[PDB]
mmCIF file of N, CA and C in Angstrom:
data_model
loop_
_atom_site.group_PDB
_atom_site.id
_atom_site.type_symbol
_atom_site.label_atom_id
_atom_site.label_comp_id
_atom_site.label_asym_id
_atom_site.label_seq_id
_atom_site.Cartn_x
_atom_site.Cartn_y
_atom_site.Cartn_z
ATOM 1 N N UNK A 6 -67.069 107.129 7.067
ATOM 2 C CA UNK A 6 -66.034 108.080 7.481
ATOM 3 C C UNK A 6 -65.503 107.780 8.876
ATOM 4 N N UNK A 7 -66.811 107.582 9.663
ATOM 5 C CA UNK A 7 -66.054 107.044 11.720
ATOM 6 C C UNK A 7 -66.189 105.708 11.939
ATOM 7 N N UNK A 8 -64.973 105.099 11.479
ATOM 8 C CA UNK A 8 -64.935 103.667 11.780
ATOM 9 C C UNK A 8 -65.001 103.220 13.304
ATOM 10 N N UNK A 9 -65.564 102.355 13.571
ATOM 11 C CA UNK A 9 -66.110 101.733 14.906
ATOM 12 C C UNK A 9 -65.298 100.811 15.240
ATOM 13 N N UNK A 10 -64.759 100.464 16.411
ATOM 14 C CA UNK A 10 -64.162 99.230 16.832
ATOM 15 C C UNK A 10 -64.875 98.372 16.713
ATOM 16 N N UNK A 11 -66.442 98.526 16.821
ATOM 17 C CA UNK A 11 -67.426 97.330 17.236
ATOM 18 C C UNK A 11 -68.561 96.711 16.392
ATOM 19 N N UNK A 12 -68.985 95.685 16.196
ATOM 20 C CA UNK A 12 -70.351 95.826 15.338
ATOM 21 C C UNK A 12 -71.280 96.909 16.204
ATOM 22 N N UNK A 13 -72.333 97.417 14.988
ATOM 23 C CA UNK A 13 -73.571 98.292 15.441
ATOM 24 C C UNK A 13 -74.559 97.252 16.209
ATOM 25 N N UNK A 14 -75.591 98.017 16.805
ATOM 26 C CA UNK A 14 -76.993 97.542 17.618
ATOM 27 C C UNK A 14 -77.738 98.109 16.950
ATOM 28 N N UNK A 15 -78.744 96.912 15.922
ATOM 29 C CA UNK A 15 -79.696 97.745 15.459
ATOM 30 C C UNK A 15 -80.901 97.920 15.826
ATOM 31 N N UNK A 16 -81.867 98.405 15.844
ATOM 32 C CA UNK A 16 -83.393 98.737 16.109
ATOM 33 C C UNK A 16 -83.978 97.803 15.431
ATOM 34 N N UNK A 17 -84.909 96.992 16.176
ATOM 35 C CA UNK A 17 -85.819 96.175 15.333
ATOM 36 C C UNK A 17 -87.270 96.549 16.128
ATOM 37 N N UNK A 18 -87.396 97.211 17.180
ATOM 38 C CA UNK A 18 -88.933 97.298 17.191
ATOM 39 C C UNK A 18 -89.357 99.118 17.650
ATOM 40 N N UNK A 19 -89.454 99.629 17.188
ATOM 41 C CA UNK A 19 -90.055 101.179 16.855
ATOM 42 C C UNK A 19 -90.500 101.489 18.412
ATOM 43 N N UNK A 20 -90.171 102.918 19.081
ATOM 44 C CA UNK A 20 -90.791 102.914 20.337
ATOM 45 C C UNK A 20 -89.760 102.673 21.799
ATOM 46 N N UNK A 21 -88.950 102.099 21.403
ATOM 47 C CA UNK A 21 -88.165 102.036 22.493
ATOM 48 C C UNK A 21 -86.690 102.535 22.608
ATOM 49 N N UNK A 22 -86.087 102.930 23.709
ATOM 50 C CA UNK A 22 -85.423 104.457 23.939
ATOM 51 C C UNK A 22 -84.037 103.268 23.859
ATOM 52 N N UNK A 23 -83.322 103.987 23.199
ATOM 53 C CA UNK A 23 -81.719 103.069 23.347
ATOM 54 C C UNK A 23 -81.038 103.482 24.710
ATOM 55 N N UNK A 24 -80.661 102.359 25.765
ATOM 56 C CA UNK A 24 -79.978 102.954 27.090
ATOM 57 C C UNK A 24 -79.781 101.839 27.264
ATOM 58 N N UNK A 25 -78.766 101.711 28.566
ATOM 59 C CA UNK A 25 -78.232 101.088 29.182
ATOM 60 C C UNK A 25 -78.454 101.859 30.595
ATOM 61 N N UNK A 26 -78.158 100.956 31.958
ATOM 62 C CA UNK A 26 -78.068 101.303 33.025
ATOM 63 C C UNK A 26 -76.376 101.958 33.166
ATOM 64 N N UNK A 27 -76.340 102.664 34.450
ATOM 65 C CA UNK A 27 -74.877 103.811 34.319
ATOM 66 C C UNK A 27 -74.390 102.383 34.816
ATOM 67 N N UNK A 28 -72.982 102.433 34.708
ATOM 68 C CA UNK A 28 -72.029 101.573 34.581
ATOM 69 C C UNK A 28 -72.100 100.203 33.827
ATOM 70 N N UNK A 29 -72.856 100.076 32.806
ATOM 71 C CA UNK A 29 -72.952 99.516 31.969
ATOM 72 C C UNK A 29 -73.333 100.112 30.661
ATOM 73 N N UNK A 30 -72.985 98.963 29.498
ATOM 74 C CA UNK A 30 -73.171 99.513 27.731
ATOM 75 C C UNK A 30 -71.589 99.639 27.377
ATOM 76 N N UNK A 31 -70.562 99.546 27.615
ATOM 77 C CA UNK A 31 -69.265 99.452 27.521
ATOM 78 C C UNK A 31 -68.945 98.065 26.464
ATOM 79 N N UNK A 32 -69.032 98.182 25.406
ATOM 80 C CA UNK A 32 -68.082 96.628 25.049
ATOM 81 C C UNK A 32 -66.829 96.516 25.220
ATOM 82 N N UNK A 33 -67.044 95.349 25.962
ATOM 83 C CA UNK A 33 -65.502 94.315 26.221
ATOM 84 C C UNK A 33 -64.483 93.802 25.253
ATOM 85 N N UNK A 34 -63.299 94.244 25.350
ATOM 86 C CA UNK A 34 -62.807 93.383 24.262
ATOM 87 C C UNK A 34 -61.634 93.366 25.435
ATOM 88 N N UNK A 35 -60.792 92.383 24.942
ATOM 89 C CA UNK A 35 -59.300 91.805 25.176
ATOM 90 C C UNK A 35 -58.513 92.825 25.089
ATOM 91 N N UNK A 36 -57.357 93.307 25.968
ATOM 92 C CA UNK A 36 -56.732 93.739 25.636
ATOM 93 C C UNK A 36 -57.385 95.269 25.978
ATOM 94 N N UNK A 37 -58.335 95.611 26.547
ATOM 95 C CA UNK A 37 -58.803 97.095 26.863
ATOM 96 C C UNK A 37 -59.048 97.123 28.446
ATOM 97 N N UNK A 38 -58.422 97.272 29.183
ATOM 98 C CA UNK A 38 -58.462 97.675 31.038
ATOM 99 C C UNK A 38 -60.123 98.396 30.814
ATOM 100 N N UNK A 39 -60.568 98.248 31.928
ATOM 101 C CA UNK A 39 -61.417 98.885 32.624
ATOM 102 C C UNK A 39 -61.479 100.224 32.308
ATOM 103 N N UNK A 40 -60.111 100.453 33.322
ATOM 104 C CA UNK A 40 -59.976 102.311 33.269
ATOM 105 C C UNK A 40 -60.484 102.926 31.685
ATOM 106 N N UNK A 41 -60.444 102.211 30.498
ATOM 107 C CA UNK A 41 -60.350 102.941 29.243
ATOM 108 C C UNK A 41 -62.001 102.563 28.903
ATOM 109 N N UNK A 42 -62.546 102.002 29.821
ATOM 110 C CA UNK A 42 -64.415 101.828 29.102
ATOM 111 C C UNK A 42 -64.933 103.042 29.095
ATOM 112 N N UNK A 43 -64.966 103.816 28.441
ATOM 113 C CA UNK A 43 -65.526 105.359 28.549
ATOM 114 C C UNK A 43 -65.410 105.533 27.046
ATOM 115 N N UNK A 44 -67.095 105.975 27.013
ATOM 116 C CA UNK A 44 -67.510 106.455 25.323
ATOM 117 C C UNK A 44 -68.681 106.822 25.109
ATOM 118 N N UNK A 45 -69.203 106.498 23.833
ATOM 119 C CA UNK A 45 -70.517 106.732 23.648
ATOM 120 C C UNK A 45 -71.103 105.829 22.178
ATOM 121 N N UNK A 46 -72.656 105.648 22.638
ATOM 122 C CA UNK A 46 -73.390 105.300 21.228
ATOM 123 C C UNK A 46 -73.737 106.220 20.363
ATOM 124 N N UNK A 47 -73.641 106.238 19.409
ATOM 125 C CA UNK A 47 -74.019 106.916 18.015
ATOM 126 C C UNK A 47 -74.651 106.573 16.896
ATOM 127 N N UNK A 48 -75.480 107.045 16.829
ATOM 128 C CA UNK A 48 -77.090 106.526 16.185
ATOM 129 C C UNK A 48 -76.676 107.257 14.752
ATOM 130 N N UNK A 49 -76.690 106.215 13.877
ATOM 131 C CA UNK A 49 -76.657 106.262 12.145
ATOM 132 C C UNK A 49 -77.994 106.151 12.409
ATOM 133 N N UNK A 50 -79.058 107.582 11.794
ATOM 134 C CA UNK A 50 -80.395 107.711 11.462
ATOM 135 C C UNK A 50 -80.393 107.896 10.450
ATOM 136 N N UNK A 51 -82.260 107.863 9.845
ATOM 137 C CA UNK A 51 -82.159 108.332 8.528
ATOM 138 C C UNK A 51 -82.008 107.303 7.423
ATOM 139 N N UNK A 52 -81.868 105.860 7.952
ATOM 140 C CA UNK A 52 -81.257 104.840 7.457
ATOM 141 C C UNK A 52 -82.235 104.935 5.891
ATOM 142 N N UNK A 53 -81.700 104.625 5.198
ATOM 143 C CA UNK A 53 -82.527 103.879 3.721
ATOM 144 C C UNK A 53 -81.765 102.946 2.901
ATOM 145 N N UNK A 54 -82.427 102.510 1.699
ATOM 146 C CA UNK A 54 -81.791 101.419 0.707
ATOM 147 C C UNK A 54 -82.766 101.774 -0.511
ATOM 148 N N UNK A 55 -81.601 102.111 -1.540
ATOM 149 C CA UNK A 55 -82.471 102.230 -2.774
ATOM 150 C C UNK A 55 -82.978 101.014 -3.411
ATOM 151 N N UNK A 56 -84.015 100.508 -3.483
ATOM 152 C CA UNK A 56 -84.486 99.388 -4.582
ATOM 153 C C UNK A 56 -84.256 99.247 -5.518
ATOM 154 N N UNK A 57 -83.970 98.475 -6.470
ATOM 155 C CA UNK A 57 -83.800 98.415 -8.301
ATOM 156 C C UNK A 57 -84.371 98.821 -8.644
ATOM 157 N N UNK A 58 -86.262 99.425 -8.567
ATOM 158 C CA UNK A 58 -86.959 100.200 -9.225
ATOM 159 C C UNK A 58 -86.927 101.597 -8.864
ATOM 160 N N UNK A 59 -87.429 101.620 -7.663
ATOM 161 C CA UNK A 59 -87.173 103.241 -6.888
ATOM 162 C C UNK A 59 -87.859 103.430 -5.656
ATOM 163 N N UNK A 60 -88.597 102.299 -4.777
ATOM 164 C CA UNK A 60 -89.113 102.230 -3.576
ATOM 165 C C UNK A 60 -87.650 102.582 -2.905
ATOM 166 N N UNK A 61 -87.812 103.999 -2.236
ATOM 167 C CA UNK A 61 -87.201 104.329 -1.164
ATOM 168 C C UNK A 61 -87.398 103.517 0.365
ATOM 169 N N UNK A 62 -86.281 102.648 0.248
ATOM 170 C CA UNK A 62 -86.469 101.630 1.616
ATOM 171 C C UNK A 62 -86.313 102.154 2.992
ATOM 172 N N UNK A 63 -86.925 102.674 3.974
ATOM 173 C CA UNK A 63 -86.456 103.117 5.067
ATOM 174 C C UNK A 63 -86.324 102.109 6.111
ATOM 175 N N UNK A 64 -85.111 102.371 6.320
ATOM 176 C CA UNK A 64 -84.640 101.371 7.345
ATOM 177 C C UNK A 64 -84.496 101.820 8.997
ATOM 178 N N UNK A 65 -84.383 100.762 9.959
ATOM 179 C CA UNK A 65 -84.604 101.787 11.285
ATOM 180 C C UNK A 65 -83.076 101.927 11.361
ATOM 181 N N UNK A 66 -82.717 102.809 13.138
ATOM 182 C CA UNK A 66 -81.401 103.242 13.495
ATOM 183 C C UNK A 66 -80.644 102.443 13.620
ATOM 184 N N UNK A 67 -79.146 102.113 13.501
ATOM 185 C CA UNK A 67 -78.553 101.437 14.064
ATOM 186 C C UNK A 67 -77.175 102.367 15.104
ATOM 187 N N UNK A 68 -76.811 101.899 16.031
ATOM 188 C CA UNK A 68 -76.226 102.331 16.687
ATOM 189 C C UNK A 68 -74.704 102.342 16.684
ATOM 190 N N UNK A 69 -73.348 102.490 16.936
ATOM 191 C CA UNK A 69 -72.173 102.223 16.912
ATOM 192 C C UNK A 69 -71.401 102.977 18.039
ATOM 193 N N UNK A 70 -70.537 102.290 18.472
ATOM 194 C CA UNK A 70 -70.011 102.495 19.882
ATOM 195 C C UNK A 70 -68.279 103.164 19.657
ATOM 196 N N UNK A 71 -68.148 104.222 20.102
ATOM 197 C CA UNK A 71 -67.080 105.211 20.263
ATOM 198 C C UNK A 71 -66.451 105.505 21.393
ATOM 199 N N UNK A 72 -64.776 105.000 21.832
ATOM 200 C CA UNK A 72 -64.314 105.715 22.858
ATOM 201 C C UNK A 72 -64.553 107.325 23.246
ATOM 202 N N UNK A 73 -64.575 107.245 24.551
ATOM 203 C CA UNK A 73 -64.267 108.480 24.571
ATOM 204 C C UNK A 73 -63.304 109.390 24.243
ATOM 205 N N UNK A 74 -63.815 110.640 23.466
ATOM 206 C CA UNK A 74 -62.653 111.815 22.996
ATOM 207 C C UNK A 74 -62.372 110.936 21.625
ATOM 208 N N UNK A 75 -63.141 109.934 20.609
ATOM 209 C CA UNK A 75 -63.327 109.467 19.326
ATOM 210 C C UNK A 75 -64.374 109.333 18.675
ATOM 211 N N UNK A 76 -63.781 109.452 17.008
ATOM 212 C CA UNK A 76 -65.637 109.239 16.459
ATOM 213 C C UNK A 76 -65.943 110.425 16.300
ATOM 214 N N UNK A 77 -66.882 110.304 15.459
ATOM 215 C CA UNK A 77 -67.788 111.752 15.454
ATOM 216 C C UNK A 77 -68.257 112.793 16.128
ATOM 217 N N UNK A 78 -68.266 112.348 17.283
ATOM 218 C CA UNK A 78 -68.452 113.497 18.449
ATOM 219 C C UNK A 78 -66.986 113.604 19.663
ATOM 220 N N UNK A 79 -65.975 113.144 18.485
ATOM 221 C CA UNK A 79 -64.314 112.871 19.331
ATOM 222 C C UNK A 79 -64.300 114.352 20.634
ATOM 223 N N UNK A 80 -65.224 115.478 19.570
ATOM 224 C CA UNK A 80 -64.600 117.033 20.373
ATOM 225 C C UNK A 80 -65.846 117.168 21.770
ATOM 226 N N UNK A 81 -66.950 116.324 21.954
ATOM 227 C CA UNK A 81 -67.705 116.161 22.733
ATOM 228 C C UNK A 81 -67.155 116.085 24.235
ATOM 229 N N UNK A 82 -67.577 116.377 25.367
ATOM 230 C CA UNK A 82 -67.513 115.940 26.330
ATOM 231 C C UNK A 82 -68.363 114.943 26.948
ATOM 232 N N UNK A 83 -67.815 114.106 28.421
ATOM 233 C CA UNK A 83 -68.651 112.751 28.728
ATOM 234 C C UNK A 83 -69.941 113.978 29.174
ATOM 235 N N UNK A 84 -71.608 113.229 28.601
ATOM 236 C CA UNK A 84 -72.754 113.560 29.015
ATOM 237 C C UNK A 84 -73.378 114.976 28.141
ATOM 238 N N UNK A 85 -72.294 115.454 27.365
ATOM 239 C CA UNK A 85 -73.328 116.666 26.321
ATOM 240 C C UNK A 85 -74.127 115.867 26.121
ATOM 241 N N UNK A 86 -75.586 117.048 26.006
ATOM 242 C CA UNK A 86 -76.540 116.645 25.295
ATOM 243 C C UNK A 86 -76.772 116.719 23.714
ATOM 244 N N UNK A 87 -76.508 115.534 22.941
ATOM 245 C CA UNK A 87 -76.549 115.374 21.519
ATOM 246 C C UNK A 87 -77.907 114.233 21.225
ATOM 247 N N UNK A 88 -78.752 114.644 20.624
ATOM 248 C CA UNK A 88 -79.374 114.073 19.888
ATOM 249 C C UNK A 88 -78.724 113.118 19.429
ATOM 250 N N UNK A 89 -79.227 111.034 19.634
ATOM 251 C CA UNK A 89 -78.015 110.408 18.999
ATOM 252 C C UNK A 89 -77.195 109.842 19.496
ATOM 253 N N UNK A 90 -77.093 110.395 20.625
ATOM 254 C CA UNK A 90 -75.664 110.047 21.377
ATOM 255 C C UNK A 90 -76.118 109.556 22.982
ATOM 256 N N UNK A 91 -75.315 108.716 23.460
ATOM 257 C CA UNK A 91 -75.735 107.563 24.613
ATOM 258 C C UNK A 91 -74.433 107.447 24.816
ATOM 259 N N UNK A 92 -74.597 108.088 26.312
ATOM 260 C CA UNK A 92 -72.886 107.804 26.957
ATOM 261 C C UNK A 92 -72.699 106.797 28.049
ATOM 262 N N UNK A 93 -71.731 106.251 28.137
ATOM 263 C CA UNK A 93 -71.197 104.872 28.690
ATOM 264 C C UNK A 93 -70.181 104.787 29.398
ATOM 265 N N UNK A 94 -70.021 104.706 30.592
ATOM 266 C CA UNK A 94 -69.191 103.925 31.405
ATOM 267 C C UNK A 94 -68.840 103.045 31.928
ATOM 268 N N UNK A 95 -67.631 102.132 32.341
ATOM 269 C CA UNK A 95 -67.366 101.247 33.484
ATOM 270 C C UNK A 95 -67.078 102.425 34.435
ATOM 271 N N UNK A 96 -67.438 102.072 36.140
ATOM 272 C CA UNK A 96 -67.500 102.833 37.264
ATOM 273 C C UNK A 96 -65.983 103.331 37.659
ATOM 274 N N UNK A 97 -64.775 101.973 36.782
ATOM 275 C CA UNK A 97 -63.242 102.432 37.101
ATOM 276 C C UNK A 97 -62.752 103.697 35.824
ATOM 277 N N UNK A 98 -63.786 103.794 35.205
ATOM 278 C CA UNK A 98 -63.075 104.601 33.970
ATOM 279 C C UNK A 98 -63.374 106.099 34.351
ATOM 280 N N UNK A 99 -62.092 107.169 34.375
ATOM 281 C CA UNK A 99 -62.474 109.121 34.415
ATOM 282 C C UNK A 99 -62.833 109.132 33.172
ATOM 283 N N UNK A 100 -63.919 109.741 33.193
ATOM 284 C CA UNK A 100 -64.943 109.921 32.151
ATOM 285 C C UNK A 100 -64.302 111.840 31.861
ATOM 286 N N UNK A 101 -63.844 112.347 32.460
ATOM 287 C CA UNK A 101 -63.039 113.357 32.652
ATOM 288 C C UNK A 101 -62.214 113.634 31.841
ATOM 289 N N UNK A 102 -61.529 112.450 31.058
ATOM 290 C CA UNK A 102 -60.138 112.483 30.204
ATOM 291 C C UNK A 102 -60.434 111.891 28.774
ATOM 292 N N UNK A 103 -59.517 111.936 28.165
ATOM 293 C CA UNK A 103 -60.172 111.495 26.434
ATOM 294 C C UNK A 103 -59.410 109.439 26.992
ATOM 295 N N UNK A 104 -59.945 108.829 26.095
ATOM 296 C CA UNK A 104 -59.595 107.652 25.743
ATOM 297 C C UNK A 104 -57.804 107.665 25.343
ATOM 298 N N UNK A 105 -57.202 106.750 25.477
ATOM 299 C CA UNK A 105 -56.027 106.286 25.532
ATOM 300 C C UNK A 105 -56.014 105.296 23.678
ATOM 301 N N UNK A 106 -57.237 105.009 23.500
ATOM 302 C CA UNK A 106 -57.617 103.982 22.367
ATOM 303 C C UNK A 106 -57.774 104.805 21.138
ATOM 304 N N UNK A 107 -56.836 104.571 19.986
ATOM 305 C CA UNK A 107 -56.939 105.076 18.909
ATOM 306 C C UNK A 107 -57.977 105.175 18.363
ATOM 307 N N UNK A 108 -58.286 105.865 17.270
ATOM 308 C CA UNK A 108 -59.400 105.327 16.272
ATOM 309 C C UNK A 108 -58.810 104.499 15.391
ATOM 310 N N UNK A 109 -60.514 103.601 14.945
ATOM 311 C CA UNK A 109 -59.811 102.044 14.193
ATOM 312 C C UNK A 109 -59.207 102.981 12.623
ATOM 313 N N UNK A 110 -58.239 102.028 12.352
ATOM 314 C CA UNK A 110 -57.678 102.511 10.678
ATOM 315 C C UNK A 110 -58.425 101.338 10.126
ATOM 316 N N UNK A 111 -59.195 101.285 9.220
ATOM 317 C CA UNK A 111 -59.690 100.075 8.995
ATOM 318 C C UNK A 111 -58.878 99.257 7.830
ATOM 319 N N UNK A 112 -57.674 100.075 7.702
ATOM 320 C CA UNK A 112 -56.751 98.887 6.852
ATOM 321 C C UNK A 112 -55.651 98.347 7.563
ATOM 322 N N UNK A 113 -55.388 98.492 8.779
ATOM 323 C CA UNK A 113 -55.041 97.934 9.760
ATOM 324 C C UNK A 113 -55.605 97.255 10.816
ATOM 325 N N UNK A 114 -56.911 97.286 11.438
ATOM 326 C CA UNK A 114 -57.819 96.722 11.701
ATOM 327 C C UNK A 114 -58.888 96.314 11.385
ATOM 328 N N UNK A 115 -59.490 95.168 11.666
ATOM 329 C CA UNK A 115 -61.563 95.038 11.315
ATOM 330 C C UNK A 115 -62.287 95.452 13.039
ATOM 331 N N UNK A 116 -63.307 95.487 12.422
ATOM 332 C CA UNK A 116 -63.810 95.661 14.105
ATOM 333 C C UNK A 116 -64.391 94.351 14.361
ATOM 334 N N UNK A 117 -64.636 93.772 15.312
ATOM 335 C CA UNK A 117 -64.649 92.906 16.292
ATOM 336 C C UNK A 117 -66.495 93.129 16.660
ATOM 337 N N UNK A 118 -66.405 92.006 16.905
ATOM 338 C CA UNK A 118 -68.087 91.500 17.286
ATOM 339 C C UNK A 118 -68.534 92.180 19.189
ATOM 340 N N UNK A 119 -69.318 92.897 18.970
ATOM 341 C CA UNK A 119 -69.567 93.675 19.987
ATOM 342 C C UNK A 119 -70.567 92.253 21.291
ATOM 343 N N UNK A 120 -69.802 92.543 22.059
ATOM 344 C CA UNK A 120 -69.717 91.775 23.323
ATOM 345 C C UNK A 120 -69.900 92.147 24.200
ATOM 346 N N UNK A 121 -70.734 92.242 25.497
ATOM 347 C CA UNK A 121 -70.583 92.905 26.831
ATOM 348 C C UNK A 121 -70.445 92.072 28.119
ATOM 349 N N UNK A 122 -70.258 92.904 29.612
ATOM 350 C CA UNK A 122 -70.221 91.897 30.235
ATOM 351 C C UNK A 122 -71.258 90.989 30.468
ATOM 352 N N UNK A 123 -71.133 89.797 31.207
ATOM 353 C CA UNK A 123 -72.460 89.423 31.655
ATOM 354 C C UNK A 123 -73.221 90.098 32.675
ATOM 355 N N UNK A 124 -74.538 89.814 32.357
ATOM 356 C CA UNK A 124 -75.620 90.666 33.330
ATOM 357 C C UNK A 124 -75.617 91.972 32.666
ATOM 358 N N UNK A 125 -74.962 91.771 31.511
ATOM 359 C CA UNK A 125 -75.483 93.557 31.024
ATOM 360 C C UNK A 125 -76.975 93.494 30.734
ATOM 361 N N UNK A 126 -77.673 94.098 30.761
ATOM 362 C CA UNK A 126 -79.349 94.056 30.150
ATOM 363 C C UNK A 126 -79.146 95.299 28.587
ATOM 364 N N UNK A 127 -79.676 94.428 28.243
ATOM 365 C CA UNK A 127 -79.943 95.203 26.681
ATOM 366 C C UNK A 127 -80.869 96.018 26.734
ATOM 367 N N UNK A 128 -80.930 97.143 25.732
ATOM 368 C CA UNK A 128 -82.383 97.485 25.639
ATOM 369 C C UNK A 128 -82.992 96.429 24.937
ATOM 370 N N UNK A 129 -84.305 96.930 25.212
ATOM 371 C CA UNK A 129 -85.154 95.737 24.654
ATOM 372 C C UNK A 129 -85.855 96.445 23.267
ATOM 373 N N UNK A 130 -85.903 95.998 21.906
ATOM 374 C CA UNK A 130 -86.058 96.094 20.546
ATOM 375 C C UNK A 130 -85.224 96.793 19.976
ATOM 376 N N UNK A 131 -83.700 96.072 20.602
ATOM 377 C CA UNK A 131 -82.556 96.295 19.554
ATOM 378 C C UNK A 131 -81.739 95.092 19.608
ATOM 379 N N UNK A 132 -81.134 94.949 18.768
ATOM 380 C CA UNK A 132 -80.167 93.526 18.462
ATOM 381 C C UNK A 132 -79.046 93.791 18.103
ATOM 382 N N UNK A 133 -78.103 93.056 18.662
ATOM 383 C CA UNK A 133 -76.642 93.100 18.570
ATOM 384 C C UNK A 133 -76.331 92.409 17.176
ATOM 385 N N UNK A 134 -75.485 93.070 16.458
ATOM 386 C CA UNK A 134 -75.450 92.642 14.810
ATOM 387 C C UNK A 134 -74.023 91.762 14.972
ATOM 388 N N UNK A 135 -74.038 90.638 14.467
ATOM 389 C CA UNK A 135 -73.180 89.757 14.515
ATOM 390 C C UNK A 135 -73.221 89.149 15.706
ATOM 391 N N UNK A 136 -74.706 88.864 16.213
ATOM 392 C CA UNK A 136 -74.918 88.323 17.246
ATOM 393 C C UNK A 136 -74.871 88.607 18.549
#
């Protein structure tokens, strides 16, 4: 239903808190100024996969990245507390105002391989999907 500009970050090791340091966790793309890095992560929990027989597969979280004032928590403000949710800035962006950046139509767009700057630090036991 909330299409993402970006690939997800998924969880591969149990135990560790999804974050970024403040002014970082923003993906970069072309074509997006500074001023508009303002959003949040959003944790698809709950994950599973039905098997061909009937082993209920549980899978861990994966994450997906939302401008601000878009997405599932579009009516949110920067920093509510939501279960789920991991908010993000660049230091030039008012976190104050909604995003300028549509939401993706996904028959007009695909989303794009999630990228950050350099020296971003990842959390550690999650992986960027599509590398």
């Amino acid at each position: 239903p909330h299409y993402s500009w970006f690939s997800g970050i998924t969880q591969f090791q149990k135990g560790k808190e999804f974050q970024f340091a403040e002014g970082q966790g923003v993906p970069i793309a072309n074509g997006i100024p500074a001023s508009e890095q303002k959003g949040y992560w959003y944790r698809h929990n709950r994950r599973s996969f039905k098997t061909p027989d009937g082993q209920q597969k549980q899978l861990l979280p994966r994450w997906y990245f939302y401008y601000l004032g878009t997405g599932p928590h579009a009516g949110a403000s920067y920093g509510d507390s939501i279960e789920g949710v991991f908010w993000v800035a660049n230091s030039q962006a008012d976190t104050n105002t909604r995003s300028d950046i549509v939401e993706r139509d996904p028959s007009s767009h695909e989303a794009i391989p999630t990228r950050f700057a350099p020296g971003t630090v990842l959390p550690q036991g999650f992986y960027v999907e599509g590398s």
